[PDB]
Structure 1
Amino acid sequence: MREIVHIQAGQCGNQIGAKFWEVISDEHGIDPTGSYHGDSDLQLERINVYYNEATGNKYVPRAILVDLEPGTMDSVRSGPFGQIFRPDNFVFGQSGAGNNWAKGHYTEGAELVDSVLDVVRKESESCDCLQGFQLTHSLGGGTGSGMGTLLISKIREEYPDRIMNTFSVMPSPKVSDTVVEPYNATLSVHQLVENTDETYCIDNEALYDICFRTLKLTTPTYGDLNHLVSATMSGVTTCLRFPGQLNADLRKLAVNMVPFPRLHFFMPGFAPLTSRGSQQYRALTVPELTQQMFDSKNMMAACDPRHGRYLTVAAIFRGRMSMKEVDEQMLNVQNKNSSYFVEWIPNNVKTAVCDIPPRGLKMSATFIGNSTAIQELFKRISEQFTAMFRRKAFLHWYTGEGMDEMEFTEAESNMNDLVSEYQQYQDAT
């Protein structure tokens, strides 16, 4: 079978995985020690996709934690699952990027990437055959912006034909948590357009609206924000782990969901999402989940999908279902909302049916769309970018680290072409 290498960059990224790796082990029934105590054996059938075996019945997650620049490190070790990682995989350095891109990609990355790329090739040859390189990081910051994109330039070079997903937490257009946030967006995405197969563009403001308007929560903590993102990750590799009546490879997604080799910037989605005690006044069916998935306030993208056009969508369904109901609900949406989509594409929807739901639920789903509604987001960042650069605002923290003025002009016109060539296809042609 195929196996997946999992990489974490940035202060954001490993905090995502710290909840996420708890979810996968609870999806199979694995202790903090690695002792398997699941219920059935059906979850044992694809342990190998993430977990390799150890000496006495122990399973080790193949997670290479690049981002443990030492302050972030001990928290991961002093967590719920600090006693589950192989401690030699904690690959890190000292005196980090400091929310500087060039300190992530040009100066301190060169003093760490040789210690990283070797550990990549360690877990690589322990696999039968590879496809999976799940980088978990954010844009906007430091390590996730400069040290994250450094590996994607390198691991593509050693592995030219492997599936490359980066579940990058994008910047927010209103809540700016970083002063240099447009300067880290334009540079890091300039790597991502060149050498990614897909990416899950995620905002926190979309996570803010979902936790508050839909889940009705008072105080959303970052463990609870990312638990929404952790639901996306396990839903996609559901079929590469569980037997489904219409399976879903990452590459089955990564041939269907992408028309053109550059336009592979995805927005995720998830359902069910509700606020209750234990009595909730609804009923789980196929059209129950379907209407929830296609909602403009149920996006993890922070954009109106009705403003843009859906190029293509992906309905990855879990749990026991019925294909005709699955087929016709995807049919009825493309009928009643045909003016929304890209009209000159024959089918605008595909399906994917796993046969096993998660633990608590009885049915579930995972929306993955690719739209010209994400044309808004880079427009909401490149305008923030181009106001800083004309006044030449933060250059002396970048030119004094090994960068150049001609690099910035080269950086945005890459991003200026995406919003240009999303306007070609949001237009009715």
Structure 2
Amino acid sequence: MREIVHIQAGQCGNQIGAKFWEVISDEHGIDPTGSYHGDSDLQLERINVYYNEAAGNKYVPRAILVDLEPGTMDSVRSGPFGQIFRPDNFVFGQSGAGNNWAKGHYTEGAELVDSVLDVVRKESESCDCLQGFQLTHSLGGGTGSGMGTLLISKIREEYPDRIMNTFSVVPSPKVSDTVVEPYNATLSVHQLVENTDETYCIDNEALYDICFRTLKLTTPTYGDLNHLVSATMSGVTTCLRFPGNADLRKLAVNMVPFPRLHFFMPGFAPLTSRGQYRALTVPELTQQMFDAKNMMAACDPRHGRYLTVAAVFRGRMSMKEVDEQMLNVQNKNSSYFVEWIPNNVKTAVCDIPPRGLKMSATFIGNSTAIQELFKRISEQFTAMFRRKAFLHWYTGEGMDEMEFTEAESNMNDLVSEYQQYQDATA
């Protein structure tokens, strides 16, 4: 039994976290009271990766819910699957973090972090063989970003030989709460570079463009963005949740050739709006999945090169046709795969589809084009930082300009490290 411990931090972290638990609960047949009512036992062979078993044939998510504010967690307990969650795993302050990384990481969040770690310990102790952790959070606020990355540092200290992966929502001015997000994101990214094994980069800019341009939603809401996030989260975790022999470490080994370059581009096909009679064809799943339009990180894959790629196809389909179409798409895009990692494109098929689609495919791309995302953040960061604009919110919590200068430099080293491998040849 290779259990995963899930942590959701802050507003974005808990909203997308709750959708995730809603979506996979339905996939495993667990109802809002934790009672199993499914029709296949494929649903229960790996149920324990994400769920604990409690007497009474109940299944309880191995999930810890964290915020510095109670608001968004009252709404979780309200929401459709709110009762599923273990009540002692709600860990909440009252102050809120004011979209301030310094409050989440250094002052308000430091006050609360030990309480969170007590619940993490008490979930890990009950794990036959802990596989690792996943965190859902945004990088643009204060709690998920600042206190989320503090948690990751503490978790590493206590579990240094355990996998730490994240679903990290990147800020965009197109979907923006405050002007200081580039500061919060830049500080968080350096933490992630050091202390996560895999970070799935969920770019709110891509989720907006997708909703606005392809789904023709003229006023996208957080709900529309999260419909895409939840589809992708169900997707990437499909092969951890159903039979097919790789734990998180084995996936990291074959996806991450250099330790700092572990920021992945997600993607999904078919792109859908909430509320699909035509099943897509294996050729259609494949080409959409590689097209910039389905990329949930606003990066152009044709502007860089793929170091590794993974794709998970869901539904009853031809593995022969999957192999053929995958090997196809690699030849019209053959220049965009590094030639010094042989066979760096890998595929899985799972015959259980997601709710509401008979054919679907999830994309996991480790592309050097991701540097466009970090350049974009870095440019917004510098635009304000060259005038020290809005810094007083941070110096007022004990931070120094130097920590911002280091975060900036660390960020630009990451961009240069990507550019190194995009020009590397055989």
Whether TM exceeds 0.5 here: the answer is yes
Flag the 1:276–1:44 CA change in 2: closer, same or farther, 3 A: closer
What secondary structure does 1:284 align onto?
Answer: coil
1:242–1:355 contact (8 Å) kept in structure 2: no
* Residue matched to 2:381: 385
CA distance in 1, matches of 2:322, 2:387: 54
- Alpha-carbon distance in 2 for matches of 1:68, 1:235: 30
Q: Partners of 1:217 and 1:399 in 2: how far apart?
A: 40
* 1:117-153 CA distance string (max 9 Å, x none): 0110011111111113110000011101111001100
The answer on whether the counterparts of 1:10 and 1:143 sit within 8 Å (CA) in structure 2 is: yes
SS in 2 for 1:183: helix
Structure 2: stretches of 5+ with no match in the other structure: none
For the structure 1 residues 397 and 68, does the alpha-carbon distance in structure 2 shift closer, same or farther, using more than 3 Å as the test? closer
Matches of 1:315 and 1:27, distance apart in 2: 19
Check the 8 A contact 1:237/1:250 in 2, yes or no. no
Query: 1 CA distance for matches of 2:313 and 2:132?
Result: 21
Task: Identify if the C-alpha distance between structure 1 residues 100 and 193 changes in structure 2 by more than 3 Å, giving closer, same or farther.
Answer: same
Q: Which runs of 4+ in 1 moved over 6 A?
A: none
Q: Say whether the 8 Å CA contact 2:46–2:243 is kept in structure 1.
A: no
The equivalent of 1:183 in structure 2 is 183
Correspondence for 1:272: 270
Is the deviation greater in 207-216 or in 109-118? 207-216
CA, structure 1 residues 37+299, in 2 after alignment: closer, same or farther (shift >3 Å)? same
Aligned counterpart, 1:404: 400
2:345 and 2:369 map into 1 onto residues whose CA distance is 17
**Aligned counterparts of 1:283 and 1:88: Cα–Cα separation in 2:** 42
The answer to which of 287-296 and 336-345 deviates more is: 336-345
Quick one: structure 1 residues 356 and 29, their matched pair in 2 at CA, closer, same or farther if it must change by over 3 Å? same
Give yes or no for contact 1:318–1:356 (8 Å, CA) kept in 2: yes
Q: Matches of 2:226 and 2:296 in 1, distance apart?
A: 11
SS in 2 for 1:394: coil
Instruction: Note if contact 2:232-2:266 (Cα within 8 Å) is conserved in structure 1.
Output: yes
CA separation of 1:39 and 1:219: change in aligned 2, threshold 3 A: farther
Contact kept in structure 2, 1:257 and 1:313, CA below 8 Å = yes
CA deviation string 1:250-296 (max 9, x = no partner): 3332111111011000111111235799xx68553321210111111
| 8 Å contact kept, 1:173–1:380 | no
How far does residue 113 in structure 1 lie from its aligned partner after superposition?
A: 1.0
CA gap 1:176/1:23 in 2 versus in 1, 3 angstroms: closer
1:43 offset after TM fit, Å?
Answer: 0.6
Specify the SS of the correspondent of 1:72.
Answer: helix
Q: C-alpha distance in 2, partners of 1:228/1:315?
A: 16
Determine what percentage of the aligned residue pairs are the same residue.
Answer: 99
Judging changes above 3 Å, is the alpha-carbon distance between structure 1 residues 276 and 420 closer, same or farther for their aligned structure 2 residues? closer
- 5+ residue gaps, structure 1: none
1:3 CA displacement:
0.7
CA contact (8 A) 1:20 1:227 kept: no
Residues 40-87 of structure 1 show CA distances to partners (whole Å, capped at 9, x for unaligned) of 222122221111122322111111001261122221122112222121
Q: Alpha carbons of 1:428 and 1:153: their partners in 2 closer, same or farther (altered >3 Å)? A: closer
RMSD: 2.0
For residues 331 and 322 of structure 2, what CA distance do their matches in structure 1 show? 14
Alpha carbons 1:343, 1:428 under 8 Å: kept: no
Task: Report what 1:69 is aligned to.
Answer: 69
Q: Is the 8 A contact 2:9 2:148 kept in 1?
A: yes
Superposed displacement of residue 219, structure 1: 4.7
* Structure 2 counterpart SS, 1:107: helix
Structure number having the greater helix percentage: 2
Local SS of the residue matching 2:348: strand
Q: How big is the shift at 1:34?
A: 1.4
Q: 1:89 to 1:352 in 2, by over 3 A?
A: same
May I ask how many residue pairs the two structures share in their alignment? 425
**Could you report, residue by residue, the CA deviation over 1:174-216 in whole angstroms, capped at 9, with x for unpaired residues?**
5543211111011111111111101011112211222233334
Q: Which moved more, 1:282-291 or 1:186-195?
A: 282-291
1:405 Cα offset (Å)? 2.2
Following superposition, the deviation at residue 341 of structure 1 comes to: 2.4
1:27-47: CA deviation from partner (whole Å, max 9, x where unpaired): 122221112111222212222
- The answer to whether the 8 A contact 2:164-2:196 is kept is yes
Write the deviation string for residues 221-247 of structure 1: whole angstroms up to 9, x where unpaired: 322321211112222222222123xx5
CA distance in structure 1 between the partners assigned to 2:249 and 2:321 by the alignment = 26
Identify the residue that residue 233 of structure 1 maps to in structure 2: 233
1:248/1:24 Cα in 2 relative to 1: closer, same or farther (>3 Å)?
Answer: same
Write the deviation string for residues 93-137 of structure 1: whole angstroms up to 9, x where unpaired: 111211111111111122111111011001111111111311000
- Equivalent residue number for residue 254 of structure 1: 252
Q: What's the secondary structure of 1:106's corresponding residue? A: helix
Paired with 2:239 and 2:383, the residues of 1 have a C-alpha distance of 45
Structure 1 residues 10-19 or 400-409, which shifts more? 400-409
